[PDB]
Write a structure and sequence with these properties.
Two copies of one chain form a homodimer. Chain A has 262 residues and is α+β, with helices and mostly antiparallel strands. Chain A has one domain (1-262). Chain A is built from six helices and twelve strands. The radius of gyration of chain A is 17 Å and the shape is globular. Chain A starts with 8 loop residues before the first helix and ends in a 32-residue tail after the last strand. Chain A binds chain B through residues 101-102, 106, 109, 138-140, 145, 179, 182-183, 186-187, 191, 193, 211-214, 216-219, and chain B through 101-102, 106, 109, 138-140, 145, 179, 182-183, 186-187, 191, 193, 211-214, 216-219. The complex binds 3-hydroxyproline (HY3) (2 copies). Chains A, B: 2-oxoglutarate 3 binds at residues 97, 99, 212, 221. Chains A, B: 2-oxoglutarate 1 binds at residues 95, 97, 99, 168, 212, 221. Chains A, B: It comes from uncultured bacterium esnapd13.
Chain lengths: 262, 262
C-alpha cells in the first residue's frame, strides 16, 4: 500500500466551487474487471435489493460482499472522503447502476440530500458520492449530468410524489426539482456531464442537482456509487423509514484497508 | 442580396470526409424569429401533416407557406446545396422538429436514404439535409448525433418494421440500423453531436447514420430541416408510396431568390 491518496488544494477548490470532481484512472483494468465480475454476481443474486425488466440497479452490496466491503475502505477512496467531509466517515448507501448499450432511461433532475433528509433523517448535506467508472463515460452513454455550483443554492423545494420508498430507486423519482427552478439555475450556472476513462472516480456533493439521459452508444455504462457520510452527520435512525441496504445504521468510523500478505 | 454563399474548399473536404458540417450564425435573430413564428403557425394548422400528444413535427410546409417557399430558395442555402450535390436541386422533403425543454424521445440510429430509396424511389444517395437551428444546439437539448464517415459504408442493411408509411415520422422507426452494425461502425469511426448557436445550419448527407436523445435542458431545440435532392437523382414517381408533403413530385430546378423592393 502507498501513502493514502489526497486531493490537491486545486482539486479541493474545484470540488467545493463546482460540487463535483473527476479523478482520472484511479483504478486499473484488472481492478475494474474484479469490480465488474462482482457486480454481475450481485445483479444475479441481489433479490429484493435489485431494480429493473432486465436488471439495472443493486443496493447495499458492501454489506454482503467481501470485495465491496474492502472497496469502501480503499486508500484510493476513504481518505478523500475524510478530506472532503472533514470528519471520520461511514457508508450511508452503496449502489451499482448499469445503463446497457442502446438502453436506459431519462433520470429527472434531483438532489440526493432531499431524499436522504426526508427518507432517512440526514440532518445536514454533509455527504458525498464516489462514482467509480466501470466503463468509459462519454457524451453518448448517459453520463451523470450536473448544474455546477448548484449545490450552493441549498436544498431546493421540490415536487413530491408516491407513498413509501417505492419510487426512490426508479427513474421517475419521488422528489423531482421543478422545471421553473431548473431553468433559473441553469440560466445562471450551466450544465456539465463529466467524462473520463474506465477506472476514473467522479466525486459529487449530496446536494448537487443531477440527471442523465439514455445510452445511445453500443457500449455499456456501469457505475459503482458509494455514498460516504460524516459520522458527526449520522442519520437520525428515529426518523428512519427505509432498510439497512438503502440507508445504513452502523455508524462505526471506517479505517482504511491495511497492507497484508493476503 | 450578396454574392451567393459557397463553402470553402476546406469546408467541402470536411463535409465529404465526415458527411456533416455546421456553418455557424448563417441567419440572424430577427430572421430566426420570423422562422419561429411561422413554425408555430404551421404546428397550429398543419392538420394531417403534423406529428405528436403535444405537437412535435410538421411535414411539407414549403408547399403551403410563402415564408418557407422563399426560405428554400435563399442565397444562404440553395447555392451550397448546388455546390455539394453538383447539380441543380429541388426540395424532396421539408420538416420542422421541436424537442421541447424536459421533453423528447430517443430517435433510433438510422439513415434517411434508406427510407427515401424504399418509400419514395430515390435512385442514389445524391441528397442532403440542411437543418437550421432555431435554438442553440448543445450537449443537453437532444442534438442530432452522427457517426462521422459513416455515410461511406453505403446503405446498411437494416431491421424493417410496420406497414405503409405510418412509422416513418415517429421516433420508433421503420428502418433501424442493427445494434451489431452500429458497434462496428462506432468502434471504427466514433460519434459526434454537432453543436452551435441559433441561426446556424447543419448540413448532413442523406446516408449518414444519425440519432438523438431527449432534451433534459430547460431550453427548446427547434430545427427546420430542408432535404435537397439533385434533379438528376429525382425520385422515381412510379415506385412512390407517400404523398407530396413527405416526398415531393415537382422536380423543377430551383433558382435563388432575387433582390426585389418587396
Ligand atoms: O433515493 C435514493 O436514496 C437514491 N436514488 C435516487 C436518489 C439517491 O441517489
Ligand atoms: O422517414 C422520413 O422520410 C424521414 N423521417 C425519419 C427519416 C427521414 O428523415
Amino acid at each position: 500500500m502507498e501513502p493514502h491518496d489526497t486531493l490537491s488544494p486545486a482539486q479541493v477548490d474545484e470540488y467545493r466551487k463546482n460540487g463535483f470532481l473527476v479523478q482520472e484512472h484511479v483504478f486499473d483494468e484488472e481492478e475494474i474487471e474484479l469490480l465488474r465480475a462482482e457486480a454481475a454476481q450481485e445483479f444475479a443474486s441481489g433479490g429484493e435489493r435489485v431494480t429493473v425488466g432486465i436488471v439495472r440497479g443493486v443496493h447495499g452490496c458492501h454489506l454482503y460482499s467481501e470485495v465491496f466491503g474492502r472497496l469502501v475502505r480503499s486508500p484510493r477512496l476513504l481518505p478523500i472522503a475524510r478530506q472532503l467531509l472533514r470528519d471520520d466517515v461511514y457508508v450511508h448507501q452503496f449502489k451499482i447502476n448499469a445503463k446497457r448499450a442502446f438502453k436506459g432511461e431519462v433520470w429527472e433532475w434531483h438532489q440526493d440530500y432531499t431524499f436522504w433528509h426526508h427518507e432517512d433523517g440526514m440532518p445536514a448535506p454533509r455527504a458525498l458520492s464516489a462514482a467509480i467508472f466501470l466503463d468509459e463515460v462519454t457524451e453518448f452513454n448517459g453520463p451523470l449530468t450536473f448544474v455546477p455550483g448548484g449545490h450552493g443554492s441549498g436544498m431546493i423545494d421540490a415536487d413530491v410524489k408516491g407513498e413509501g420508498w417505492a419510487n426512490t430507486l426508479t427513474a421517475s423519482l419521488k422528489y423531482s426539482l421543478d422545471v421553473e427552478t431548473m431553468r433559473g439555475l441553469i440560466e445562471r450556472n450551466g450544465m456539465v456531464a463529466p467524462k473520463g476513462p474506465r477506472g476514473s472516480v467522479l466525486w459529487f456533493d449530496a446536494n448537487i442537482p443531477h440527471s442523465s439521459v439514455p445510452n445511445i452508444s453500443p457500449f455499456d455504462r456501469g457505475l459503482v456509487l458509494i455514498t460516504y457520510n460524516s459520522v458527526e452527520n449520522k442519520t437520525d435512525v428515529t426518523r428512519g423509514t427505509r432498510p439497512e441496504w438503502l440507508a445504513a445504521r452502523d455508524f462505526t468510523p471506517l479505517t482504511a484497508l491495511q497492507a497484508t500478505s493476503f
